[PDB]
Design a binder for this molecule. Structure first.
Ligand SMILES: N[C@H]1C[C@](O)(CO)[C@@H](O)[C@H](O)[C@H]1O
Ligand SMILES: [Ca+2]
Ligand SMILES: [Ca+2]
Lengths: 87, 853
């Protein structure tokens, strides 16, 4: 048997274990370890927006109860259900 | 300001009569044969030696170490006014006992001691003691005055205004002596220093709710609100005087082994005064709160940032302001609509061109999880097409003149009438008017601003209502003036509650106020000016309101009048960020000053101030919960935390939030630094930006830049924060908490945290809330319940702990019920002695402990 590797922040800086990616705690000073959560103050969340142009939003707007992406994927656990409106 | 519009004491005939009586031998005498010790009170007749008028003294000892003194005519021609609806309950009395007697003296004991009251018969005098320590004297300088109702003392004129005064001179007055007291505080509202000045060489402080256009600083003119409560502080004791009178009142303060004398003079009503005997100032807080109630728990959103001006012009403007906050990464909870949103200043309406679809506007704001505030003033345009005016006329709910016609004055919509808010029928009508069917276009995220409720009357004497206007029950306006605004505030707050079926907590801002206004929402200091000295005076003005129970206080950020220079606006945002009510507002003729309209360096410093305020919302919320339950002020003078440090007795360029944070905002243009007094023997303070520790007592010189807000955390405290700043407080209220632990020199710290749903009464009707205690001692941080009754379903968890003043541990261990023992990673900066514990991950509702090995 053979195992697996860790994650390094895109700003060099530090390298964290792979279970600390998207674990809802900010570990990289550039926010790069939490692309899918609201944990980092300087992170970004990527709206694929498959039916329109893609968009980046602030990490603070992930699961804030407000629909920021037209595809609605920034709200996945907030109690706000966002409809797809990229049309 | 135009001073000639407002009476001096010499121009107030009852103030002139009363103030001409100078300290000397009082002609009043107690008739000890009439003494009657009753179930609740001691009643004894008083006699004026010359005029033979007979008065009744009602003297009561009260639970919680208070005394109540009431004096009224024995056989009056007509009943005098006694202030209703201010006291939350009939105060529980304590039994009085005659424990000593003379031929000129009776000594009374409250219950079984140690408080005693000595009644001297000739001349009339009262002394209050703890055991044999003299606390307070009443009528010691013989200034008691009680003008009995007889069959400029009568018909009187000021400028062009006539007061028919059909009952003639009826004023009442009384003096109080405070041995050992050199510092007194309170009786807002005045644009003056926190420590009240002696009035001997000038005017007395005036308590009369008045609309003072472009009011000026450092003077005793009456402003919009009146709280007749004075606090006296010394190294040894704290006392409070509560003069329960709703009529125009003047207050003289004189010095004299050190002793301060206080004299109250009111135009009508009875003498009704509460003596709150401490001994600590927090005892005085508790004593006053038991009388007039506590600060209403604000809905969480109302502690965020409010963006306002006169006026946002239409729905598109409101939505553009909303979007500008998000486009510029600035949090904001509420956008305000001033008087131009209505149809020609007909309140409860909407301008059909500029606000044609208010429900849609409110829906767009709700989708951003923001709120709106609409102004509703108590003057009603005289207009037969205006349904509100028609119903109030047809039901006889307006204030009336002596000839029985409805009073008509001038205000924003021109000729206007004034509902009689002292009439409970009017308040019930007003409250029902806020239902979603009556107030068409309103929605659950619309709240209310009551302005001009002194009431302001543009063509009236001193810009208010005629003295001889007639209210419910036949009382004159001179009798009720200072609680008119309170009633508007009360009836509006009740309307927001009832429109929700009794579920939603209200938010109402009011300009005029009285004792008890803390129960109904927020107040602010009115129309200030965009100048550096008005920035400075917001601290002592709100501090004076905090000491008398009104914790939800603020001043217009940036100044109402004129255009602030960018550096002043930045400093005002930093100042306002650490004051309870945090609203930017501006006059019709000012330039637009939404915070993203400035150059980037000023924007960044304002954004940083907004981020700090939002991160501290769990802290502000808990302080307001403590205010709501105990009656303790949120914003505090330094002498409240350090009653024995005499060098703090006058400080007003610094304040504290609770017991944990000391604030010294920069309040001078071009400042290179500030001088920060850090008090407390063996006390340490942490610079919350640099984590640098400082020992008290000292005056620290702190260099500052544009973005500096000098804030220090006290050792021995724990401050909770939401480090994930979002666009509004609704977005944040389920986010994880970070705990900031400031270690005392003994390695200890404590703090509380209140949580609920953020906006309903479920905390009180269903006990749906959490009150946590966090305590650190040894090397162990422990979370326990501070109120077991409180249970709440919430996803909030502890994501981080920051400990200031700690060494590097060898290991960090977490234990919580229901979980295995867990190990936490950590970071330690040896230069600053700051320990960061990574992701504890524990629910905020769970008991847990973290141990540093
Ligand atoms: N002067 C009053 C009236 C006002 O000018 C418009 O209603 C408002 O903007 C002020 O804040 C208030 O104090
Ligand atoms: Ca992480
Ligand atoms: Ca979102």
């Amino acid at each position: 048997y053979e195992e697996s590797k860790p994650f390094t922040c895109l700003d060099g800086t530090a390298t964290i274990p792979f279970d600390q990616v998207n674990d809802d705690y900010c570990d990289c000073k550039d926010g790069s370890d939490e692309p899918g959560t609201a944990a980092c103050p300087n992170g970004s969340f990527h709206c694929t927006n498959t039916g329109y142009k893609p968009l980046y939003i602030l990490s603070s707007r992930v699961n804030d109860g407000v629909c920021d992406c037209c595809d609605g994927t920034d709200e996945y656990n907030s109690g706000t259900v966002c409809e797809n409106t990229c049309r | 300001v135009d001073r000639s519009n407002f009476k001096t004491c010499d121009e107030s005939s009852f103030c002139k009569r009363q103030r001409s009586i100078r300290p000397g031998l009082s002609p009043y005498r107690a008739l000890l044969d009439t003494l009657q010790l009753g179930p609740d009170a001691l009643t004894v007749h008083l006699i004026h030696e010359v005029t033979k008028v007979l008065l009744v003294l009602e003297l009561q000892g009260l639970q919680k170490d208070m005394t109540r003194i009431r004096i009224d005519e024995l056989e009056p021609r007509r009943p005098r006014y006694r202030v209703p609806d201010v006291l939350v309950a009939d105060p529980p009395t304590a039994r009085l006992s005659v424990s000593g007697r003379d031929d000129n003296s009776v000594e009374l004991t409250v219950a079984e001691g140690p408080y005693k009251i000595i009644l001297t018969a000739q001349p009339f005098r009262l002394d209050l003691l703890e055991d044999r320590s003299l606390l307070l004297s009443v009528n010691a300088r013989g200034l008691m005055a009680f003008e009995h109702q007889r069959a400029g003392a009568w018909e009187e004129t000021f400028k062009t205004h006539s007061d028919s005064k059909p009952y003639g001179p009826t004023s009442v007055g009384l003096d109080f002596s405070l041995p050992g007291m050199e510092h007194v505080y309170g009786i807002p509202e005045h644009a003056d220093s926190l420590r009240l000045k002696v009035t001997e060489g000038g005017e007395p402080y005036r308590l009369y709710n008045l609309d003072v256009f472009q009011y000026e600083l450092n003077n005793p003119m009456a402003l919009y609100g009146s709280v007749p409560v004075l606090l006296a502080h010394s190294f040894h004791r704290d006392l409070g005087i509560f003069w329960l009178n709703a009529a125009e009142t003047w207050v003289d303060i004189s010095s004299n082994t050190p002793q301060t004398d206080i004299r109250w003079m009111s135009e009508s009503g009875i003498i009704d005064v509460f003596l709150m005997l401490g001994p600590s100032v927090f005892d005085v807080f508790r004593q006053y709160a038991s009388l007039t109630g506590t600060q209403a728990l604000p809905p969480l959103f109302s502690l965020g940032y409010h963006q306002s001006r006169w006026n946002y012009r239409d729905e598109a403007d409101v939505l553009e302001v909303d979007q500008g906050f998000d486009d510029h990464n600035m949090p904001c909870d509420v956008i305000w609509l001033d008087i131009e949103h209505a149809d020609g200043k007909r309140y409860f309406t909407w301008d059909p061109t500029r606000f044609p679809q208010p429900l849609n506007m409110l829906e767009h704001l709700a989708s951003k999880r923001r709120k709106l505030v609409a102004i509703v003033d108590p003057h009603i345009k005289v207009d037969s097409g205006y349904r509100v005016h028609e119903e109030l006329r047809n039901h006889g709910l307006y204030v009336k003149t002596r000839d029985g016609s409805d009073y008509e004055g001038w205000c924003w919509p021109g000729s206007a009438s004034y509902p009689d808010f002292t009439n409970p029928r009017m308040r019930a009508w007003w409250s029902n008017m806020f239902s979603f069917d009556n107030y068409e276009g309103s929605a659950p995220n619309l709240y209310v601003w009551n302005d001009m409720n002194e009431p302001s009357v543009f063509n009236g004497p001193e810009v208010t209502m005629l003295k001889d206007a007639v209210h419910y029950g036949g009382w004159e306006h001179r009798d009720i003036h200072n609680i008119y605004g309170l009633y508007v505030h009360m009836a509006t707050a009740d309307g927001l509650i009832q429109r929700s079926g009794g579920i939603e907590r209200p938010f109402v801002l009011s300009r005029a106020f009285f004792s008890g206004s803390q129960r109904f929402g927020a107040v602010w200091t009115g129309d200030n000016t965009a100048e550096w000295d008005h920035l400075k005076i917001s601290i002592p003005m709100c501090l004076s309101l905090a000491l008398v129970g009104l914790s939800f206080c603020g001043a217009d950020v940036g100044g109402f009048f004129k255009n602030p220079e960018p550096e002043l606006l930045v400093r005002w945002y930093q100042m306002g960020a650490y004051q309870p009510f945090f609203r930017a507002h501006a006059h019709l003729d000012t330039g637009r000053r939404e915070p993203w309209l400035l150059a980037s360096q000023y924007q960044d410093a304002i954004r940083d101030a907004l981020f700090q305020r939002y991160s501290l919302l769990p802290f502000w919320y808990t302080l307001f919960y403590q205010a709501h339950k105990e009656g303790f002020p949120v914003m505090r003078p330094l002498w409240v935390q350090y009653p024995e440090d005499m060098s703090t007795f006058s400080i007003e360029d610094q304040f504290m939030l609770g017991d944990a944070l000391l604030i010294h905002p920069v309040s001078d243009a071009g400042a290179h630094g500030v001088q920060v007094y850090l008090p407390g023997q063996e006390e340490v303070w942490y610079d919350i930006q640099s984590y640098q520790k400082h020992h008290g007592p000292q005056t620290l010189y702190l260099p500052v830049t544009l973005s500096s807000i000098p804030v220090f955390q006290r050792g021995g405290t724990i401050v909770p924060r939401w480090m994930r700043v979002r666009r509004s407080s609704d977005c944040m209220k389920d986010d994880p908490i970070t705990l900031f632990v400031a270690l005392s020199p003994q390695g200890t710290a404590q703090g509380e945290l209140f949580l609920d749903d953020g906006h309903t009464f479920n905390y009180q009707t269903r006990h749906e809330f959490l009150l946590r205690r966090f305590s650190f001692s040894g090397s162990t941080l422990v979370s326990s319940s501070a109120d077991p009754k409180g249970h709440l379903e919430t996803p909030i968890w502890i994501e981080r702990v920051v400990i200031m003043g700690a060494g590097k541990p060898a290991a960090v261990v977490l234990q919580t019920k229901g979980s295995p023992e867990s190990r936490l990673s950590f970071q330690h900066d040896p230069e600053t002695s700051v320990l960061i514990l990574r992701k504890p991950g524990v629910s905020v509702a769970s008991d847990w402990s973290i141990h540093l090995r």
